Structures are given as structure tokens and as C-alpha cells.
Design a protein around this nucleic acid. Structure first.
Ligand SMILES: [Zn+2]
Ligand SMILES: [Zn+2]
Ligand SMILES: [Zn+2]
Lengths: 195, 272, 106, 123, 71, 93, 192
RNA sequence: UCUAGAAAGGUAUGUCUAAAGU
RNA sequence: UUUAUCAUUGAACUAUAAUUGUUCAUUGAAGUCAUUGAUGCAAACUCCUUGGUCACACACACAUACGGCGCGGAAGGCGUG
């Protein structure tokens, strides 16, 4: 027989046509994704500190650091440190998730654009994206969304959109700044700009 | 009949080729001729007809000798030759692409390094290529992607974690379009430090002992002194943040807001 | 203070005039009343805000209009008001003399 | 280091073996699994070799120093046709008493897990 | 025991490296439980010289099976 | 029959980048589509290093299982469930 | 078997006049119906006549160049015709089961009460009550929504997409029974 | 010649039916 | 220290070769990148990870060479229940 260690469910006589159909089962995929997210979360979250090997401090070290001065240590209440740790965990996750993607937004009308940045017509990873689209054997999966697909073909040329300014363009977004240091910005710009 | 002979006896090929060979410096004829030859081999793989691969190579090479500032077609011709089996040719295609741009193009360095990560498999040589790309196209206003790619390779290969602090301190003084991400890396990485010996990763120990009045080898209670350390280094980073924020926001408000087109387009286009 | 209360589950045939009438001139004279209609259909979404001047006026409206029958329903008058790293900048304006005008070409 | 005399390969899990192979290569890695065909799973192995050039230095006639090529390979599995010998190098990160404590704790957690799974599916 | 999963590579062109040094190309037609394979129109990629109208390779000496065709 | 932890671990790495060196000296490295019970693997979008160093590229490859010398799976499969020593399977069917 | 040379021995030994009851002539023509449905849930058991590959490739040679033996065709047509007419009876039973659901008693009295409730503005009231009765018939359909696959006889539905239908139509049952219907259409055109 | 009663499940899949407010 | 493709021909050309050797060119096969590389040799500096940073003491021992006669911990050897 077979036993899906992640799934926790047995199975009958292990035939590759049964086993491979289990291994692309949607519920098995949810269980496996939960397992590996939790294990990576556990090895990130585990602060194992080095063991402390305290030696006996000498005399002259004791005179110097007894005659420096004493520093105040700051510490916070329980709800303060809980709220701060929630903030720190979401900030580390959005730094890990984000990525600068302005070279894609910035060449948006260029002549050979559909052959490089489309990501489905790329010659290296071209067949893989179409191949791994998935069956979608669910009618309501396609019947959920009612927007356009906007499949930009590889066969597009230079002739369409001859003048890029006249088709309505967007200005690039202003550079994002740190919110904790958002008060250190210069308060007035130089040139009077409207809208 | 095969794909090549069938393609030659087609009627469209004589028309597309005569329009290209009459009007060379009009781009849309070249791209129509090129899309037709590529569509005429509907599976492209290693077994397609060599008399037809030689013609796709002659078409791309002759177009790029006519219109040498077309960034996307160097990437596409190199990725075609990378599909066809030989990375040795695709190195040359990217490198003549960089040379026709006189080494100062951001997109060809970014695509050449995301290519070269896979195939160069020797660590000091790949890092010499990143140092070359740094000294040419490093100070680009949109080169956040290059530096973030470089930090990705440094944090995945190296075991020392000194080179990361070095490169990140050089990012901190460049006025990039998206420098706040490269400041948030530095902020959370200072905040993720644990003991006093690791403050010498940033600067030298005597620079700390003089400028910030902080001793690494202070042995004693090292809780409050480490918290004092993190607050003083965060203050210095706040001041350097003010300087880079001023320069970035000044360039953006005055000049870089107004340029809308950054690409070569075609010889028949007009700039506003 | 521009204290805002968020009335909800309103009847369809209840107007901003009636929403003003049930909010202004009882316990207060509220500065504004605004029901959210549908942006292309016009039919009211069943919830809307009202803006009182004083915070004591709004809370006095809040305790008394909670559950109160307005045109067939109970109109649920909860208060409307009162962590990303990266935000876009925002800046003041230099008040447009002849120096700080970017089109000044004389 | 000293290894117990009656200690087969089933008992040396989480040691740091030094697996020789058919080519002169050596995979210094932490063992964590094995099989009937003796094809190990080494955790952090470092495939070394002595080059064709410095092999003259090993030829029989201070000491001798050989420069080997450490090439890091993360979580290999080996193919058992290639293996030639295994030699223990380093003891584990944990003790024996600590592994006893941790094994009783894992088995206790598994029995609580199956208890909750059974009493949840009966409800 | 277990058939190899070459149901995709059927009736296409294939480049396989016999025995290390040699290298043969041909149109695959059949395979078995051991990886012995039978391929139509075999041409030994070296100036290359052709083998014969049909071959049957003993699967002891196949190392890799590169598929030249789309698959 | 029964497979044990290494071949079952190789079956746990279907879909991800592996790097394997054959016994002839070559080194192939791509996304592993279908492995089998006899360590007979396929690999898609691979980067094929010949023994004297000449790296080429090829779309799919099917190595014989018998020629593999090692297979380098990702790092996180250290935490795979099959390495758990004390397991409590619920009940047979 | 367990060692691969055992299975290879099994295959070569089953590789190594040509008439009489010993050889399933229906397999010899091609696609024995007790062979195409071995493992599935419509399994007939085992094919009684033995199947053998030496005889089959001798038949491939014989119908390549030598001759055709029409007694094999008439035997295959008899077995094919009895199976196809039997499954035509079974698809008749399946649509009978849909009818028997459709003429269920309490549902007929419920639709009869709603159709007595169906009884200018009289036409507008009648059309509103008849659209309510149409939705009652569609509520009975939303309990089921079953059509019958006309080849195999198994149930299907239309609310389902084309892809789960494509999951059905590449079955063992449906491909086997499509092959049976196609040889029956070929032999009934050729004999007539 | 020595007394033939074939399983009953598992996983994958869609659809129906349904349970929620502020 | 040591390497950086061959051919067909032209002009000349030492020359058993598939004009090899030599300068320049055409055409032709395929053609990992590297030459700040590769291989050999030696040193210096910096940075990581690991542990009893334990207790008593600041002392005149030893031919059977050396009280192995403090509390522990890690690993192995041997014996008993
Ligand atoms: Zn599962
Ligand atoms: Zn039969
Ligand atoms: Zn059907």
C-alpha cells in the first residue's frame, strides 16, 4: 500500500496511476503547502542562542567598568511588545515578498516588448508557462472572474501605437519613502506644480 | 515538402522580402519579415531544418546590424540561440549587444546577469561580471533591480556575510529611484544583530571608538550598551537617509518626472 | 471635530433629506448628512454617514438613534471614525510668485 | 574519535560519516538515512578529490600537504553502486542523554496527536 | 515490474548516447521493461554514417535519452 | 516492494530544481518532472555540463536510473516528514 | 512479476492449422471485448479463448498480403452485435431510470398543485406562475441535471465544463465501447 | 465421484444542497 | 611557468599527409566562459563556529618515574545483577 505522510490518509495498492493522481490532488497540495510554510516558519522563528560561558572578570577590568557609569535599560510592557512584534513580522514579510519591478513598467511600449517581458512568449521558459497553466476542470473557476485576459501576442509589430504620448500614458509613481522617517522630508517643494 | 521549401514557394515571402529590401530603415517591415519567418517554424527545437535556422540567424543579425540600439531584440536573439542548444553563441550575442550600447545599457546588463547566473557556474568569474556591470551601469536611476539581483547572489552564495554589509553600504549612498527598500534592509539588519562583536561588520572598530564613542570590547553588562549602540547607528543612518532622500526627491520632482519615453522605438519616430 | 456616525441598513425609500431630518434638529444641528447611493444605479446602498460638529452631539445621537425605527428598519448608527513601511511623499506648495513658477520664461 | 564496536550503519544516524567511493572522491557529510542497497542520504556533504596534478605528492618516497577541491553539495542522496567504504568522522550535535529526552518527547507528542485525531473523527 | 515512462517520447526523433563515447539518433518506436529500445532510421551522429533500416539497442548501454523533437 | 527513505525522498522532489551527476562524468540540472522507483529521472529545462566542461542546453532528458552517481535535492527537504523517527500512523483500511 | 527477467520470460514465452476453438478469433481480428474491459467496473471476467501474439502477427502477415478468412469476421460480428445490443438495452434502462425519476408520484402531485396554481394581465399572472412552475421543473432538474452519454450509457451533465467531460471521454469504458460501436458500424455498412 | 456463491472499500473529480451576521 | 580551433584555395613556401610548417585574405565544420584565467609555491592579515571558560590552590616532586585520593560532564573498553 501507500501512505501520504503529509495527508495522513492511507491508500490501496500502490499503483503509479493512483499515486500520481493523489500527488496532484488539490487537497494534498493544500496540506503540503501548509506543512512546508509551517516548517520554514519554525526554523525562522526559533531563536537558539549560544550557550553562555561566563569567565571570572579580572581586577583592572572591574575597576574600569565600575568607574565608567551605569546606563539605563529600556523595557516595555506586555501589550507593547506584542504589538511591536506583530508590526516587525509583517514588515519582514513585506520586504521578503516585494520586488522592484520598474523595468517592466518602463519599457511598456517598446518595439520588441512582447518577445521578452510577456513571460509566456519567452524562448527559454516559453513552453513551460503554457504547459503548467493547469486543467481548470472547474467551470466555475473560469466563471468566477469577469475581466479581460489581455493576452499580448508575440506577432505584434512596431506599427501599432505609432505615437506613445497620444495614447494616454501614465507618469511614473513617486519614489516610496520610509513611513517612520516621513517627517524628515523637505516640507515645501521648489516649483509650483498643479494637480 | 518540408518547412523550408514550403516557406520559399510561399507567395508572402517574396513580398515581405522585397518590401524590406526596398525600404531598409523602416522598422515595421523588418518586424513583419521576422515574425513571418519565426511563425513559419511552428515548433522551434533542435531538429528543425538547418537551411531555415541559418536564415533566421541571418535575418536577426542583419536587422541588428541595421538598428543597433534595439534592446529587446538582442535579448530575444540570444534567448533563441539559448533555446537552440548553445550557450556559447548567446554569450556573444549579449556581449555585442552591450558593446553596441558602449556598455552603458541597464536592460542588457540585467538580462545578461539573469542569464549568466545559470550558466557560468564559477563564483569569482560571476562576481567579476557583477563588478563590471556595477562600474558601468551602477549609478543608473532605475538600477534598483541590478543591485537587488546582486545582493541576491551575494546572500545565496557567500558564507561570510561581510560582503553583504559592504555592498549594502555602497547602496546606501547612491540616489536610486527606490532607495527606501535598500534602507529597510539596512534597518532590519541592524535590528537583527545580536552581540557587540558584530558591530565591526559595518565599519572599523576604531571608527566606532572615535566617532560614536563606543567600545566593542566593553565587557560587562552588554544589554544596555548594545541598545545604545543600535540607537546611535540608527541615528547616523537617519542622517544619511535625509541626504539621499533630498537628492532623490529633487531629481524626481524636477527632471525624472517628465521623461515618459526611455526606449529606442524606431528611426521614424518623433520625440515630443 | 467633524464627528461622523455611520448609519446603516437604511430603507431604500429613505432620502438624505430624511436622513438629515432624523439626524439634524434632534439632539443637534448636524453639519452634513450623506447616504451612499449606487454610483451608476442610484438606488441607495442602505448605509450612509452623517457629520456632526460636536463629539458630544454625535454620541448623544448615537445612544438615542441606535435601534430607532426609521422608515421601516433599525438604522444601526455606529461611529464611523474615532501598517505599511512605504508611503508616497506629500509636500506643500510654494505659493506661486515669479521665481517659483516653472513656466516663467521672461 | 572512538565509535562503539557493535554499531552498524543503522545506529550511526546523525553522525558525520566520510563516505569513500569508486573514484577517489569522498563525501564528508552528516548521515540521516540509508537503505537495503546502501545508498545513503548525506545532509551537508562536501565532495572532495585529489587532483591529477598533486597525486604525485602522495606517491611513496616535515610532512605532506595535499590541496583538495572542496565542492559543497547540499542534501545529496547517493547511489549505492558507487560506495566503497564508510568511515565515521564526527559525533553528533546532541549527546546520548539529550537524544533520549528528545525521543521520549517526540513519541509522547505523536501519541497525543493520534489521540486528538481519533477523538476528533469520532466527533 | 515497472515500465519506463516514455509514453511522451513515442514516434519522435531522439538523440541517445550509447555507451559513453558513441551517439545515435533515430525515430523511437518501442521500449520494454528493461530500457532496451527500438528506433527506426538510425544515423550514428559522429561525416556521420547510417546504421540500418531498424535497430534495437540493448538498454544496458543507454546513458541518456535526449529528445530532439517537440515532445 | 518497499523503497525506503532515499528513493522516497527523490519522489518528494518532483517539481523542483535538482542537480545530478551521472557516472560518465556529466552534470545535468533542471526541474525534475517524473522520477521513478529505480531512480530513473526526467529533467526539464536543463543545463547540461559535458565531462570536459562544455555546457550546452537541452529541453528534456531521460537518464537511465543506473547511471546516476548522486542527486542534489533542495535544502528544505531536510524537514520532510519521512525523516521523522517516531511516527503514529492512524489505522489500516 | 518480481524480477524483470521473469516478466520478460513470460512475454517471450507467450510470443513463442491456425483455426479451431483454441484461438479467440475476435482478438485475432482485433480488440477482443473481453480484453478491452479487463480491469474496469464493467469487467466480464476473463476472455475464455486464449490470446497469443504469434497467432496475431501471423494474422497481420496474412491480411497484409495473403488472404482474409470471413468466418473470423462473422464470429467477431456475432460477439460484437450481442454486446452492442445488450448495452443498447442498458442505456434504454438508464433513460428509463431518468423517466422513472421524472414521473415520480409526489413530484407529479407537487407540479400538479403548482400547475393548478398556474391557472392581458391574466396572461401576465399566468406567465409569472408558469415561470415559477418552470423554475419548479428546473428545481427538480437542479436535484439531478443528468443527461445520458449515448455511447457508454453512463450519466453526464451539461452544467459541468468541457474539461471534466474530456476527463470522462478518455476512459477505459468509453474508449472500449466507442471501439465496439465503430467496428459495428463498419461491419454493418460492409455486410449491407 | 470429495459438495463452485467475487468482494467491499481508497484516493482523485465536478455539480447539487446548505449553513452567517455587524 | 604554460595555453588560446582546423580546412579549400590564392601570392610566395620549408616540404612523406588531409600544402602540415610561414604572413595575408576568401570560403567551410563545429565552436562553455575564462587569459585580471588555469596549474604549481609560500606567507601575512581579518572574520566565523565549538567548550566546566567548575571547585580547591600560587605550593618544591621524582626510579617501581612521578599520592590517577575534589565535584561533575562527553565518548569508548570490561565485568555483574
Ligand atoms: Zn495526501
Ligand atoms: Zn478474446
Ligand atoms: Zn461515456
Amino acid at each position: 500500500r501507500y501512505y501520504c505522510e503529509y495527508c495522513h490518509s492511507y491508500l490501496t495498492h500502490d499503483t503509479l496511476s493512483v499515486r500520481k493522481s493523489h500527488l496532484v490532488g488539490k487537497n494534498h497540495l493544500r496540506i503540503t503547502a501548509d506543512y512546508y510554510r509551517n516548517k520554514a516558519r519554525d526554523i525562522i522563528n526559533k531563536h537558539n542562542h549560544k550557550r553562555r560561558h561566563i569567565g571570572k572578570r579580572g581586577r583592572k577590568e572591574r575597576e574600569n567598568s565600575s568607574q565608567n557609569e551605569t546606563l539605563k535599560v529600556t523595557c516595555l510592557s506586555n501589550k507593547e511588545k506584542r504589538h511591536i512584534m506583530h508590526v516587525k513580522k509583517m514588515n519582514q514579510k513585506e520586504l521578503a515578498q516585494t520586488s522592484i519591478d520598474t523595468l517592466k513598467l518602463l519599457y511598456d511600449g517598446s518595439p520588441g516588448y512582447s518577445k521578452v517581458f510577456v513571460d509566456a512568449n519567452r524562448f527559454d521558459i516559453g513552453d513551460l508557462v503554457k504547459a503548467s497553466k493547469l486543467p481548470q476542470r472547474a467551470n466555475e473557476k473560469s466563471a468566477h472572474h469577469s475581466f479581460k485576459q489581455t493576452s499580448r501576442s508575440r506577432d505584434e509589430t512596431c506599427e501599432s501605437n505609432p505615437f506613445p504620448r497620444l495614447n494616454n500614458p501614465k507618469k511614473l509613481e513617486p519614489p516610496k519613502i520610509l513611513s517612520q522617517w516621513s517627517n524628515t522630508i523637505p516640507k515645501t517643494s521648489i516649483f509650483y506644480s498643479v494637480d | 515538402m518540408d518547412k523550408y521549401t514550403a516557406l520559399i514557394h510561399d507567395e508572402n515571402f517574396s513580398t515581405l522580402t522585397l518590401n524590406v529590401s526596398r525600404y531598409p530603415k523602416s522598422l515595421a517591415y523588418w518586424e513583419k519579415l521576422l515574425n513571418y519567418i519565426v511563425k513559419a517554424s511552428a515548433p522551434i527545437c533542435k531538429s528543425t531544418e538547418p537551411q531555415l535556422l541559418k536564415l533566421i540567424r541571418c535575418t536577426y543579425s542583419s536587422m541588428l546590424n541595421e538598428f543597433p540600439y534595439l534592446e529587446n531584440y538582442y535579448i530575444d536573439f540570444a534567448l533563441l540561440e539559448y533555446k537552440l542548444g548553445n550557450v556559447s553563441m548567446s554569450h556573444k550575442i549579449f556581449q555585442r549587444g552591450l558593446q553596441a550600447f558602449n556598455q552603458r545599457s541597464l536592460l542588457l546588463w540585467t538580462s545578461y546577469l539573469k542569464f549568466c547566473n545559470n550558466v557560468i557556474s564559477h563564483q569569482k568569474q560571476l562576481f567579476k561580471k557583477y563588478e563590471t556591470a556595477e562600474e558601468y551601469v551602477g549609478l543608473h536611476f532605475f538600477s534598483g533591480e541590478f543591485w537587488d539581483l546582486y545582493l541576491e547572489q551575494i546572500s545565496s552564495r557567500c558564507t561570510s556575510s561581510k560582503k553583504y554589509w559592504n555592498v549594502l553600504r555602497k547602496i546606501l549612498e547612491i540616489p536610486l529611484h527606490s532607495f527606501s527598500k535598500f534602507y529597510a534592509l539596512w534597518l532590519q539588519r541592524i535590528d537583527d544583530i545580536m552581540d557587540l562583536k558584530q558591530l565591526s561588520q559595518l565599519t572599523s572598530k576604531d571608527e566606532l571608538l572615535k566617532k560614536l564613542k563606543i567600545d566593542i570590547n566593553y565587557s560587562g553588562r552588554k544589554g544596555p550598551y548594545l541598545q545604545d549602540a543600535k540607537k546611535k547607528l540608527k541615528k547616523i543612518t537617519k542622517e544619511m537617509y535625509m541626504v539621499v532622500q533630498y537628492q532623490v526627491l529633487e531629481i524626481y520632482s524636477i527632471f525624472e518626472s517628465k521623461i515618459y519615453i526611455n526606449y529606442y522605438t524606431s528611426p521614424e519616430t518623433l520625440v515630443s | 471635530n467633524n464627528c461622523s456616525i455611520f448609519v446603516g441598513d437604511l430603507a431604500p425609500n429613505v432620502t438624505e433629506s430624511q436622513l438629515f431630518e432624523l439626524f439634524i434638529n434632534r439632539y443637534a444641528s448636524t453639519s452634513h448628512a450623506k447616504i451612499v447611493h449606487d454610483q451608476v444605479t442610484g438606488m441607495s446602498k442602505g448605509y450612509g454617514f452623517v457629520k456632526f460638529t460636536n463629539s458630544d452631539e454625535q454620541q448623544l445621537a448615537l445612544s438615542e438613534m441606535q435601534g430607532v425605527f426609521l422608515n421601516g428598519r433599525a438604522i444601526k448608527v455606529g461611529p464611523t471614525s474615532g501598517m505599511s513601511q512605504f508611503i508616497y511623499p506629500v509636500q506643500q506648495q510654494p505659493s506661486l510668485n515669479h521665481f517659483t513658477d516653472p513656466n516663467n520664461t521672461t | 574519535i572512538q565509535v562503539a564496536h557493535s554499531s552498524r550503519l543503522a545506529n550511526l544516524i546523525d553522525y558525520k560519516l566520510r563516505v569513500l567511493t569508486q573514484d577517489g572522491r569522498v563525501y564528508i557529510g552528516q548521515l540521516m538515512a540509508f537503505d537495503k542497497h546502501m545508498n545513503l542520504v548525506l545532509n551537508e556533504c562536501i565532495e572532495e578529490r585529489v587532483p591529477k596534478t598533486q597525486l604525485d605528492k602522495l606517491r611513496p618516497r616535515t610532512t605532506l600537504n595535499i590541496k583538495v577541491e572542496k565542492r559543497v553539495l547540499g542534501l545529496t542522496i547517493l547511489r549505492g553502486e558507487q560506495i566503497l567504504s564508510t568511515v565515521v568522522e564526527d559525533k553528533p550535535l546532541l549527546s546520548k542523554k539529550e537524544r533520549l529526552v528528545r525521543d521520549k518527547k517526540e513519541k509522547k507528542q505523536a501519541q497525543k496527536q493520534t489521540k486528538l485525531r481519533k477523538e476528533k473523527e469520532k466527533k | 515490474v515497472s515500465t519506463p515512462e516514455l509514453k511522451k517520447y513515442m514516434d519522435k526523433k531522439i538523440l541517445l548516447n550509447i555507451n559513453g563515447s558513441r551517439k545515435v539518433a533515430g525515430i523511437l518506436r518501442g521500449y520494454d521493461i528493461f530500457l532496451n529500445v527500438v528506433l527506426d532510421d538510425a544515423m550514428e551522429i559522429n561525416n556521420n554514417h547510417q546504421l540500418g533500416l531498424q535497430t534495437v539497442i540493448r538498454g544496458n548501454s543507454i546513458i541518456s535519452l535526449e529528445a530532439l523533437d517537440a515532445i | 516492494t518497499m523503497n525506503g527513505i532515499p528513493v522516497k525522498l527523490l519522489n518528494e522532489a518532483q517539481g523542483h530544481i535538482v542537480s545530478l551527476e551521472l557516472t560518465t562524468g556529466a552534470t545535468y540540472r533542471g526541474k525534475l518532472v517524473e522520477s521513478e522507483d529505480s531512480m530513473n529521472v526526467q529533467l526539464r529545462d536543463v543545463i547540461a555540463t559535458e565531462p570536459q566542461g562544455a555546457v550546452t542546453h537541452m529541453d528534456q532528458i531521460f537518464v537511465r536510473g543506473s547511471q546516476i552517481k548522486f542527486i542534489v535535492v533542495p535544502d528544505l527537504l531536510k524537514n520532510a516528514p519521512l525523516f521523522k523517527k517516531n511516527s503514529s500512523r492512524p489505522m489500516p483500511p | 512479476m518480481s524480477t524483470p527477467a521473469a516478466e520478460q520470460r513470460k512475454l517471450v514465452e507467450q510470443l513463442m492449422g491456425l483455426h479451431d476453438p483454441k484461438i479467440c478469433k475476435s482478438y485475432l481480428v482485433g480488440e477482443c471485448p473481453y480484453d478491452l474491459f479487463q480491469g474496469t467496473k464493467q469487467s466480464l471476467g476473463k476472455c475464455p479463448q486464449m490470446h497469443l501474439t504469434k497467432h496475431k502477427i501471423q494474422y497481420e502477415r496474412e491480411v497484409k498480403q495473403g488472404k482474409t478468412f470471413p468466418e473470423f469476421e462473422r464470429e467477431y460480428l456475432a460477439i460484437l452485435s450481442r454486446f452492442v445490443n445488450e448495452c443498447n438495452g442498458q442505456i434504454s434502462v438508464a433513460l428509463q431510470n431518468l423517466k422513472h425519476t421524472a414521473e415520480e408520484r409526489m413530484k407529479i402531485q407537487q407540479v400538479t398543485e403548482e400547475l393548478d396554481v398556474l391557472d392581458l394581465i391574466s396572461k401576465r399572472k399566468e406567465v409569472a406562475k408558469r415561470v415559477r412552475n418552470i423554475t419548479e421543473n428546473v428545481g427538480q432538474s437542479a436535484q439531478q441535471k443528468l443527461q445520458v452519454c449515448e455511447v457508454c450509457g453512463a450519466y453526464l451533465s451539461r452544467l459541468d465544463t468541457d474539461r471534466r467531460l474530456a476527463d470522462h471521454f478518455l476512459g477505459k469504458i468509453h474508449l472500449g465501447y466507442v471501439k465496439m460501436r465503430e467496428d459495428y458500424d463498419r461491419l454493418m455498412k460492409n455486410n449491407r
